[PDB]
Amino acid sequence: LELTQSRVQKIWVPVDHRPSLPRSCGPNSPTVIVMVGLPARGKTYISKKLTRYLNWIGVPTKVFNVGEYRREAVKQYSSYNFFRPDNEEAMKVRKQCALAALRDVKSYLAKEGGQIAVFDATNTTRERRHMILHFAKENDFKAFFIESVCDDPTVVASNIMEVKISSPDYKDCNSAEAMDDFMKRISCYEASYQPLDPDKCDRDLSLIKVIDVGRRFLVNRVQDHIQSRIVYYLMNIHVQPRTIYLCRHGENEHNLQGRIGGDSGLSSRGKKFASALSKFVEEQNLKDLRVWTSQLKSTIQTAEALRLPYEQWKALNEIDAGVCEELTYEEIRDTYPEEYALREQDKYYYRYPTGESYQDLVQRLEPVIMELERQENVLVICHQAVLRCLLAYFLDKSAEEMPYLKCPLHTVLKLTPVAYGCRVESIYLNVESVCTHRERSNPLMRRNS
Amino acid sequence: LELTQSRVQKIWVPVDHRPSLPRSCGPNSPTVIVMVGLPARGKTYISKKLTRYLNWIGVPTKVFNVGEYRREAVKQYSSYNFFRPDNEEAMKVRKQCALAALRDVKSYLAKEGGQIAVFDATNTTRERRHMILHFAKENDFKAFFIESVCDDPTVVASNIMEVKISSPDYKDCNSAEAMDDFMKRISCYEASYQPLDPDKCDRDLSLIKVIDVGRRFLVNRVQDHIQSRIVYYLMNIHVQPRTIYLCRHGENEHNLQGRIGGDSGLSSRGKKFASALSKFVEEQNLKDLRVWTSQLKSTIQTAEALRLPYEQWKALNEIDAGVCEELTYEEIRDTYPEEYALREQDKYYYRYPTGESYQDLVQRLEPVIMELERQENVLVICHQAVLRCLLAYFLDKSAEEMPYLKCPLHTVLKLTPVAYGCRVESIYLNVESVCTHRERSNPLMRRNS
Ligand SMILES: Nc1ncnc2c1ncn2[C@@H]1O[C@H](COP(=O)(O)OP(=O)(O)O)[C@@H](O)[C@H]1O
Ligand SMILES: Nc1ncnc2c1ncn2[C@@H]1O[C@H](COP(=O)(O)OP(=O)(O)O)[C@@H](O)[C@H]1O
Ligand SMILES: O=P(O)(O)OC[C@H]1O[C@](O)(CO)[C@@H](O)[C@@H]1O
Ligand SMILES: O=P(O)(O)OC[C@H]1O[C@](O)(CO)[C@@H](O)[C@@H]1O
């Protein structure tokens, strides 16, 4: 009934005329995601990628890699002997590392505001999983299991060459021995490995078993929305090689005037960029390539120069500046001094009046991200704010830095999937344009001064 | 480079100054969804619901129920004897009905603009499925299988009582005999039933096996985006009973002035409605109830009167009228005569300048629909256009009728899941308000007149 609108987010909240002595209380039970599987099955890759996605959509998530706890407690790896099932002392150390990680998991989910903790380890025995389940039960945490099953030697071999031999554990080995050492290591777990059995022993566990690198999936009893989103995400990512290209529309008339928003067309330079973009695409020599644009004129004119079929996404339209659309920043500062200052203090959360925030952008872009994960070669022609959000997802940048990422005109960001993330290459197409980047930029309210 | 903006959708397209004699060509290979399973497993329910969802998100889909073809060719059902595996003549009729349905499937996907055809039948043998696969291959159609497996007699019994005994096949039977007849019917298929075997015999088929009413899922090789969306949808719907309530914000100041859009607060009547809404909710006596609002003031003030926790969704915000926000329809007609007339001729596709269309609304609302499917009891407090879109989904209304559905103020639409769809009950809370509904509303351009 009597609400007030927050200045930054523009969210209507009930006015709480706190009493003489206001109370607070404070701070959807958190979830422990349990990775399961033999080594070199992509557990860490999945852990890191899923975590990159959850944080980007706004769900605070953290990976707890037992591997790093062991590397911290033992200093330098020598051989697979450390992992022999008959290595009583190492078995003890490994367990102690697991418990210390769970300790931090508990502190993360119950005291630091975390919502999803990804417990990244082999967890190959019912006994170990049972212990984690116990830990979850006693702390009131939900538990979801992700098991990667892969019995294709070609895949395991490739995985070892791609991330294991260059691992710090093998800093003193050459390819041949690292590979040999890792294979023996894997064999150590093979005898006691008890895969998840949703149809019998694990009927009541919430889980997804990822088979043959995402070829087949076995999903058992999803509990809530977050698990539902996780399952959807995991079933649409793949590891086939491809390349993702991101760039803004060629320079437009509004850019020349320093005006934000609008739907202006390409300037003479923007058009030169479009031709150059076509030449660049041509030279990349891609078998197939999907091209996506927003529904705003500038990105579409740019794609037209490619002479390739392209798809318009309303979700790729630049951030909506509300009542500030069509204005120069100078006019915003002069006409809306308060809004200008508010956005400068909280650029990620700030929402333009009757417009959007970077936070809204991210929600709007989720479907684009999901489809980008499913695709192969794709070129996305968009706008500044939109590109910053997309790049923040691929490069795992925080919400605080997202709105300040540098994404210049006439420049193509070439993203190639490698190891546990994305390698980024910048390629400026040598066509002049203005610069639209803007970096981040009390007394009388205390006595004497 | 030289594009023109479509007047209705506001989409930039390349100007095609067609030559003296313009050419056309015309009209993503279509998909045949194959239902699989014993009778009373929810195949028709899933077929109809999935179809309701696809059409609503814009993917033309049609169900081909072989059952209806048989009811058309044989006139009146007598008993399960028709379905005996030793009934040579009926086996022939059934096959002929299948082929005639496939005939229509082919005509639907290849000549009528259809994109997804749902082949609804038992298709319990590898032999029958192999025939459909052949049909798909020769027509260049993709094939996706949905198999519902349920071995819980309590579920089958309930299913029979809920949709079979009132089926037209049993128009001359009482509950007891219809039930008995259907059970014998099911037994007819049990000997030859060959479930999908993704791990062996059906390794190469794209499929989802729905187990224990959505408890567990087995998914094998999704081929494209549409199959991906279908899988996601199927894994989030359930059949637990619950109730969905939809209503608009109580009457607001803009409503009183006949102004569209804006973010005005509740009028004195709107506030009375809010109190009445609270009384109504209270009397419904719901164990638990989730309450969702948009981020606009009026829906939030309304929810505040409930004294229940509620969740704000930016996706529930009323359609954005762009440059027409805050205007009365009179002012729109006078200031933007052309826009006014264009919207009247194509209300579903028409997009306001720098604003939205009902088509955009639907895309914006997909996540709300998906989450509504996952939830139990939910009350959604929204706005006129938004409510029309939501209602169109639940009541399977077309895009053409969607923008004209009647959704009056101070009125609660109570939706209860029954049989193959949703029963709708209207409950006006007896509080006056204005009416915001507006129904649908050459010569000189031909010689003499
Ligand atoms: N579902 C999967 N099955 C098998 N390998 C995968 C899967 N997903 C990713 N990978 C691959 O696994 C590698 C990363 O493996 P890593 O995560 O270190 O394995 P692990 O943590 O299980 O010991 C990458 O080369 C990646 O392409
Ligand atoms: N996955 C499922 N498993 C079992 N029953 C289901 C499922 N989904 C829906 N139902 C139920 O099945 C009934 C509809 O069955 P129907 O579609 O006529 O079966 P069929 O077409 O297989 O002969 C409804 O009562 C519905 O609640
Ligand atoms: O988020 P920032 O730093 O204010 O830049 C936003 C602007 O960038 C632009 O794409 C201009 O370069 C505008 O259309 C948009 O409003
Ligand atoms: O789609 P319609 O029939 O133009 O009605 C749309 C309008 O309904 C309203 O909710 C007013 O009742 C406006 O805010 C919105 O613009």
UniProtKB/Swiss-Prot annotation, chains A, B:
CDD domains in alphabetical order: HP_PGM_like
Modified residues (Phosphoserine): 449
Marked site: Transition state stabilizer: 248, 255, 383
Record's GO cellular component terms: cytosol; nucleoplasm
One Pfam family from the record: His_Phos_1
Chain positions covered by the region annotation Fructose-2,6-bisphosphatase: 241-449
Binding residues annotated for beta-D-fructose 2,6-bisphosphate, in chain numbering: 248, 255, 261, 329, 343, 347, 358, 384, 388
GO molecular-function terms, A-Z: 6-phosphofructo-2-kinase activity; ATP binding; fructose-2,6-bisphosphate 2-phosphatase activity
Region (6-phosphofructo-2-kinase): 1-240
Transmembrane segments: none
Active site, renumbered: 120, 150, 249 (tele-phosphohistidine intermediate), 318 (proton donor/acceptor)
Taxonomy, superkingdom: Eukaryota
Binding site residues for ATP: 37-45, 159-164, 340-343, 384-388, 420
InterPro entries (alphabetical): 6Pfruct_kin, 6Phosfructo_kin, His_Pase_superF_clade-1, His_PPase_superfam, P-loop_NTPase, PG/BPGM_mutase_AS
BP GO annotations: apoptotic process; fructose 2,6-bisphosphate metabolic process; fructose metabolic process; glial cell differentiation; glycolytic process; motor behavior
Tissue expression per record: Ubiquitous.
UniProt KW ATP-binding keyword: yes
Catalytic activity of the protein: beta-D-fructose 2,6-bisphosphate + H2O = beta-D-fructose 6-phosphate + phosphate; beta-D-fructose 6-phosphate + ATP = beta-D-fructose 2,6-bisphosphate + ADP + H(+)
Complex and partners: Homodimer. Forms a heterodimer with PFKFB2.
Function as written in the Swiss-Prot or TrEMBL entry: Catalyzes both the synthesis and degradation of fructose 2,6-bisphosphate.
Membership in a protein family: In the C-terminal section; belongs to the phosphoglycerate mutase family.
Protein name listed in UniProt: 6-phosphofructo-2-kinase/fructose-2,6-bisphosphatase 3
Designated gene of the protein: PFKFB3
